[PDB]
Design a protein around this ligand. Sequence first.
Ligand SMILES: *[C@@H]1O[C@H](CO)[C@@H](O[C@@H]2O[C@H](CO)[C@@H](O[C@H]3O[C@H](CO[C@H]4O[C@H](CO[C@H]5O[C@H](CO)[C@@H](O)[C@H](O)[C@@H]5O)[C@@H](O)[C@H](O[C@H]5O[C@H](CO)[C@@H](O)[C@H](O)[C@@H]5O)[C@@H]4O)[C@@H](O[C@H]4O[C@H](CO)[C@@H](O)[C@H](O)[C@@H]4O)[C@H](O)[C@@H]3O)[C@H](O)[C@H]2NC(C)=O)[C@H](O)[C@H]1NC(C)=O
Ligand code: NAG
Ligand code: NAG
Ligand code: NAG
Ligand code: NAG
Ligand code: NAG
Ligand code: NAG
Lengths: 266, 266, 231, 232, 436, 438
Amino acid sequence: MFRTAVMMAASLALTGAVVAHAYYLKHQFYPTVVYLTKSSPSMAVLYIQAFVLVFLLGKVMGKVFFGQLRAAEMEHLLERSWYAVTETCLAFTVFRDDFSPRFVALFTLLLFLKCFHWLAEDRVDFMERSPNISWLFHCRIVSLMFLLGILDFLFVSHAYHSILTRGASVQLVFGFEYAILMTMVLTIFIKYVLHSVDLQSENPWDNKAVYMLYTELFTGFIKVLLYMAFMTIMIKVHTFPLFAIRPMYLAMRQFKKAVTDAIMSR
Amino acid sequence: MFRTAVMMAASLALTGAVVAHAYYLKHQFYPTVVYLTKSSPSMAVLYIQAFVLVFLLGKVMGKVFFGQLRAAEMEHLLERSWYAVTETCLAFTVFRDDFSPRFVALFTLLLFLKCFHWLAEDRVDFMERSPNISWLFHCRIVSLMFLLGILDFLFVSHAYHSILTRGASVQLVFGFEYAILMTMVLTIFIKYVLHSVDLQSENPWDNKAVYMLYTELFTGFIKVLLYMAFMTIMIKVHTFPLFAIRPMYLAMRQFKKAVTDAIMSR
Amino acid sequence: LSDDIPFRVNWPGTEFSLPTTGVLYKEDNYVIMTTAHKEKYKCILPLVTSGDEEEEKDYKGPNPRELLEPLFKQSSCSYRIESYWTYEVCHGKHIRQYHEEKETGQKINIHEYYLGNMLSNEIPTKNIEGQMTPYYPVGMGNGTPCSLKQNRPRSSTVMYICHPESKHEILSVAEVTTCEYEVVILTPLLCSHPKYRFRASPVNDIFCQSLPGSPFKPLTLRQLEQQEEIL
Amino acid sequence: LSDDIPFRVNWPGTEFSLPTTGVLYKEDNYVIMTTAHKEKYKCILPLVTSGDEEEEKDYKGPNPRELLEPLFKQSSCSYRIESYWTYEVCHGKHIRQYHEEKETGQKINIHEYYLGNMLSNEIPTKNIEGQMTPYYPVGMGNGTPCSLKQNRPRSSTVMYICHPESKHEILSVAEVTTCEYEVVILTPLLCSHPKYRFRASPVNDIFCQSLPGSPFKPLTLRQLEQQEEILR
Amino acid sequence: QMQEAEMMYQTGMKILNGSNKKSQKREAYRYLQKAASMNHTKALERVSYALLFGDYLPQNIQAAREMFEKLTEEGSPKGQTALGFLYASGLGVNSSQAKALVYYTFGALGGNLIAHMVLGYRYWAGIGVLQSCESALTHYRLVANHVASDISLTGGSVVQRIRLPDGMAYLYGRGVQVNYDLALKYFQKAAEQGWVDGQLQLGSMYYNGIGVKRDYKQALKYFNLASQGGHILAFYNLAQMHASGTGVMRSCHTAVELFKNVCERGRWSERLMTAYNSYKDGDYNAAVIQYLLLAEQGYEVAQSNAAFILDQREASIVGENETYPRALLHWNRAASQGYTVARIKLGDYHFYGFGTDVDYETAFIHYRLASEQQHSAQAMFNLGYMHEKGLGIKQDIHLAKRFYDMAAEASPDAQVPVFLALCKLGVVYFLQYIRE
Amino acid sequence: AKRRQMQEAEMMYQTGMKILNGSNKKSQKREAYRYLQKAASMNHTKALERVSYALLFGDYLPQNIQAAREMFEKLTEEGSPKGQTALGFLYASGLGVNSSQAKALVYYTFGALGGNLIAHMVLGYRYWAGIGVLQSCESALTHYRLVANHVASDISLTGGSVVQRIRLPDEVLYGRGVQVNYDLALKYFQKAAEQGWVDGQLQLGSMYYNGIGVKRDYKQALKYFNLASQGGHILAFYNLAQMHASGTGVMRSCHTAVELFKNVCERGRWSERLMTAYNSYKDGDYNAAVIQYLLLAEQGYEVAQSNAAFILDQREASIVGENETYPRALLHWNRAASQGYTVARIKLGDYHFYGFGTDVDYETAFIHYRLASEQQHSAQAMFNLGYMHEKGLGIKQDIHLAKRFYDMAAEASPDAQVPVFLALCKLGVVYFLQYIRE
Ligand SMILES: *[C@@H]1O[C@H](CO)[C@@H](O[C@@H]2O[C@H](CO)[C@@H](O[C@H]3O[C@H](CO[C@H]4O[C@H](CO[C@H]5O[C@H](CO)[C@@H](O)[C@H](O)[C@@H]5O)[C@@H](O)[C@H](O[C@H]5O[C@H](CO)[C@@H](O)[C@H](O)[C@@H]5O)[C@@H]4O)[C@@H](O[C@H]4O[C@H](CO)[C@@H](O)[C@H](O)[C@@H]4O)[C@H](O)[C@@H]3O)[C@H](O)[C@H]2NC(C)=O)[C@H](O)[C@H]1NC(C)=O
Ligand SMILES: *[C@@H]1O[C@H](CO)[C@@H](O)[C@H](O)[C@H]1NC(C)=O
Ligand SMILES: *[C@@H]1O[C@H](CO)[C@@H](O)[C@H](O)[C@H]1NC(C)=O
Ligand SMILES: *[C@@H]1O[C@H](CO)[C@@H](O)[C@H](O)[C@H]1NC(C)=O
Ligand SMILES: *[C@@H]1O[C@H](CO)[C@@H](O)[C@H](O)[C@H]1NC(C)=O
Ligand SMILES: *[C@@H]1O[C@H](CO)[C@@H](O)[C@H](O)[C@H]1NC(C)=O
Ligand SMILES: *[C@@H]1O[C@H](CO)[C@@H](O)[C@H](O)[C@H]1NC(C)=O
């Protein structure tokens, strides 16, 4: 971890240099901070510092909540993160919310939560075929799945109440993103429930697994329909978003794989 | 030709109709002519009618001065008039003298004088090999030559006074053209004198050809010197003339056909 | 349609008698009137003729020749600027016109001409600015000869017109014939005689009576008049 | 040096004696002055000291409460509007801080807060807007309890500073600490006493003597003098 | 019973304000007439001020005057004014200026700004009253103050003065108006070169994208609005400086005409299009009547316009024996205000004998005043012909010859008529020379 | 020989003045200044002033206060109106001469009698802000109107060339309809230009290079409209002041008359000296960028007062002593304070806070921040107000009203949210630590 420490030290030196440069011009607290906020290189370097700190925090969280990666979902997580980042950038550029030090962190937090949800999904998928799993990992994954879901629900409630008390704005899309995250958390909970049935029985269950899969598919289809209904309200008001279509395509693909699986099972 | 008379009558009727209309619009003499001058569909008619009247007057003058056309100089006169008209239009637009209905009459008079000079040259050319010429034709030719010389002298005197009183203007080119016409008339006078000297004696004269060749060489040298001076005067002041090039080529061709022929013969 | 007829409305009050001298005032010409603040007025007008000359024009003064004597003795002259020439006019001495030709640097050429030199019950009336007004003509000549008149000396007549704001200036320059010009001069002293005074039509006054129950004159032009006084 | 000491130009003429009372006049700080029309002026300046307080502060006037009793007994008191609240102060009776909320049609809520009720050789002085002026206070407390300090009843101090044109108005209201208040009142009365009058700096006069051969008043100033009064 | 009339008048006013359509305007006018049938004052005057003029209602002059009788007996501030207007220029009634004076002065008594404008104009240029400074200046300021009151808020709608026949008095100050002029002309040259798309080469103009030039001229018109707004503000301000006592000394004769310019622009000057539009599609009987109000108010443009349409005898109210004196009157009024062509028209009036008796001396003086003041070659050529043939004054040649020469170099378009005239003069001289 | 010397001096100065009038080149200006220096060598009083106001202000000549002074005594004993003004300025600002206010006042008055204009503007302002004299309506009224007449008279002819008031510490009842029409037409023009055929990233490639052809004449239209609208408003102010002072319409009202007279005078002709000073602060010449600003500060400008205080603040100016550069900056900070400038009041608070110039005094810096917060709603003022309340600077330490001041600092401006958030977290942390320690 020497390279990461060196990079963090270099980033710390850079932000120290910029704050010293700012403080030398305007010797007081308030003008120093206001000039740091106003000037483009200063906000850019603080954005880099925030990104580095967020990356370090994410690495620490992944180390705490996951003992060791399987080295087979890193590309899947990277692809999902790239898609989510592109979608968030498109939403920000379409909503014309402008570059302010109050909404960029919301997008970064949403991307981090999406990455955590993807990691949780991969962890559940791996545990579905794990023949030697300790009770500690099972008890800690449920705790992470619950705490993250509760935080996402609280943020969604805060944004939804702010939007209702204010009107139609860009926070609605963030609410929908959090709703999708909450749906993922519910799916993770269902996966845990399914694994519980698999864990307690030393015999395969065909009908029970089929019923659990059908219930999860129906819940996902309902979530996809809710997301599509939320997305479709952006045409009559404001203008064409020109975004959030890749997740809609993935939702439709999941819905088709659900309908086809149910038809084949029937 | 009855068609020419019909066309002249139609032009006169059109001018009378537009004048009567303008009189009907504005009842007084002064306001009924400013409308005639500045408006396009009434001002465009007048100088066409003026050109038709000028052509009719030229035909009448040629009918009085010449008994009948030989039907051989008509094409040459038409080509010379087409060249002179193109040259005059180019010079009219080159100097940027604007459209004023007071300088057009001078250009028309100059074109009439040039046509008369070309007709006189063609008549002297025919009179060179004319074995049956009455005294009336010679008297008419002498009167026409004297009138042309007097007119050229008056025009040159006016142009010189304008050039010395006002300054550099479009009158200098007119004076140069008048000098060129005066040289062409001195050449025609010399040719007529030589022809009359040959005609008065019932024997060919060998020295007549030598005198004609010497006079032609002198006239070509004078024309070349005049063209060179005009080129220098146009190059120095105003702008690029880009005209009088075909006449300069013709003058150079005449100078060559004189000097080289004299050198070969002598 | 007689634009130059004057009028002026006054409010003599309630009790008033129509004047007899000058113009005559009838009764059928009356007009009902009411104001925006419910004030009832009864107004009458005269016949607008202003004809004749029954102004009792009695003048015991002498002829106007002595009036212009001080101008001749003073010898203080004014000038007039035209487009090209400069008409210098004096009364009693001469009338001269000249144009300055300023050469480049050393000398100045002068082109000076000479207009002239000075060594009846119905008064004549001229038309100036469309109005008829009397004037006193004078005659003088013996100026510079003109080739157009076959070496005949020029002659000109000086016109006299009154103006209270005049300073013996020249109003306009005009000519009647070649080498025969006319000069108009505004003198403020000649009009003191009633015959030579400016022909101004006497004003014809209209009174509009105010009947009892309303003040002698209407109520808004009060605050209008204090307003125009303190502005 | 500062923007406090005022000066005034005077033109006594030719004869003038330097006063020995007030400011001090010395013979070294003179200026010979020539204006545009060639008149000579000898302008003398006062010493810029403005020191001490030997103004003979001896008055047998009444007590400070004498000038305040009629105002308290007047029972006619003023108001003031703030960004949100509206502090109504009634001298000698009480100060009411409140805000009226206008509900949609029927209710008019008044959020009242009670600022209190009533049942020395050197005069204390207070600085306002950078100027140090002596005042007369009114100690006062027992308002409504303030919940931030386990219900200690509020206190308020009534600050008195005079102003020659006054309507018993409030200039400023202050919150030195939470639920402890300071409010000021401007009245035209109480500075008849020696000490509570505004300390005007003495006007250091300058004199411009007129030497012989020149008028005692410059011509341009002479015409500008009547110009202003006719334009007045 | 008055509430129904008030409701009808309110409905008509709402229809008129919310819709400028001709049919909606006609319906609103009919509703206003229905309201006025019970003699309700406001809508009565509203339909009165357009019924007489036309282009809103049929032009009924006699019913208009009979209505105006009771309108004035009520005490309507705006009813006095138009009745005095009608009685002034002999419109459908015998003309006399004294009753018109009293009616106008009692209209201005009631606070009507049209009547204060009228009193100020007729006192300034001495018509119906003696020429004076103080009264006209005061009455003009009383309207110009309200003029700027409208200009500063609404923006001062810009109207295009169109003529159907088409001290410090040099510029009435300098400075601010000059720079307004250069700003306007720079904006015009900017917009003009902005429209240029000759170097498009499959682009630039976006293949007949009209949606860019429409906004261009719209922005040009709005900048015109702003610029003439500032112009009028500045002109009123210099008028008040020159007026009372300050900046420059007391100067009435260089302040009243500035005030009059400010009042002239104002807001009344929207009837100019209401009359030009009426004239452009027949309806010659409404043009002289809408123009007469503005020519009583004092508009030089309206004066000349009403006089021009009267001179060609298309007005139907006036008798054909009276159109010429009235047109002479109004052309002389336009002359008093300095409009050039009115002077030559008046000179021809005295020349061929329209209305007045043939008198060449008067024609000559109007031609001369037109010549040396406005440098107009028309009347000056006319007086040159006067010398040429010898009417009124003595006959000679050289005078007319030199004024013909000065006409030649005076205007560029005068090259051909003087040449013909000089040719004729030379022909006459040569014939006389031959006869000598 | 005196007459011949005077004639030669007149010819030389006339030639220099003609060169200055006809040539705007810097080298030409310097040569003309050298010629005027030659003319001032033989005491040509016109040239004497024309070179003293350039060798003291250092705009076209190398600056030297001492020579300017020694020739100023002679320009005054002769009796010039433009040598008394500058001598009064020197005596007022202590510039190379013993400071005194009475001498400054008498010199300014005797510049006013000689018909000077700048002395009249200075005396009007110093009678209007109550500096050195008794604050008054009438005196400031007259000494402002006497320049108002001249400035309106010259503007009614030439238009009064525009000047923009750029700010060093910041950058480095009629006329509604006309302005709304103006800027609405501006927005229509702007959207017309932006619609075009994609006026920016067009097809491009090697570029068409057909030429923009729109920027320069549009800018000329904007600047000329600016000059004319300023002209209209300054005559509007003049008319309103005369209406308010003479009593016509509005009864004589003191404050407004002098106020609009001041606002009329400030936009006058001498204000090109503002550019003259700033273009000399660039290129890095402070010693002539503080005198040309000190004078305009004496005149009555608030832009000049703030810029002179900002130059003197950072110890840049070298003419004034380092021992006096802060009080001579505190004077101008106070002067730009009473004329309604936020940064002036905040920096006055700072000067009383850190103990600059005068001794440390928390109580009065407290009062100055309170004024800059209440009267003018300045975010930073109330931010430091909350800070002073938090650690009990000047008054009793309380922990709640500080929270209120920080919160409405957050509400008042959208730019203070980051420092208020960080400081509020610090507040909560220290409150929690104190509670835990209890
Ligand atoms: C243009 O004008 C508009 C006017 O309409 C401005 O509108 C603002 O509107 C908001 C509402 O969104 C107002 O915010 C608050 O308004 C009320 C009242 O709160 C004020 O008073 C509080 C009282 O607290 C103290 O008051 C006494 C004073 O003597 C003390 O003695 C007492 O002990 C007590 O402590 C006050 O505290 C508060 O200031 C801040 O104080 C706390 C502590 O620091 C902060 O944490 C707060 O955030 C607060 O900002 C206000 O000054 C409030 O209602 C209160 O009462 C109801 C009664 O039912 C309760 O239900 C409720 O919970 C609360 O307790 C509101 O809830 C709201 O928070 C604001 O005051 C208005 N501003 C102004 C200037 O009027 C608009 O801002 C203007 N636009 C501008 C200026 O740009
Ligand atoms: C009032 O209206 C009635 C309508 O019935 C009309 O007859 C009457 O003449 C009106 N009053 C006046 C004074 O005209
Ligand atoms: C106008 O007055 C004349 C003369 O007084 C008279 O003949 C005519 O009948 C009157 N006309 C009207 C409509 O009153
Ligand atoms: C006009 O009035 C008089 C009256 O006789 C006269 O000139 C003429 O007859 C009238 N005109 C017409 C057209 O009747
Ligand atoms: C005035 O000019 C004279 C003439 O040379 C010179 O000697 C003198 O020094 C000048 N005055 C001053 C004060 O320098
Ligand atoms: C001004 O003050 C300084 C400092 O003490 C002193 O040396 C100087 O003499 C004073 N100036 C005068 C003219 O006295
Ligand atoms: C300003 O004051 C200091 C403080 O003692 C003193 O040294 C001197 O008077 C001045 N400073 C300098 C460097 O001269």
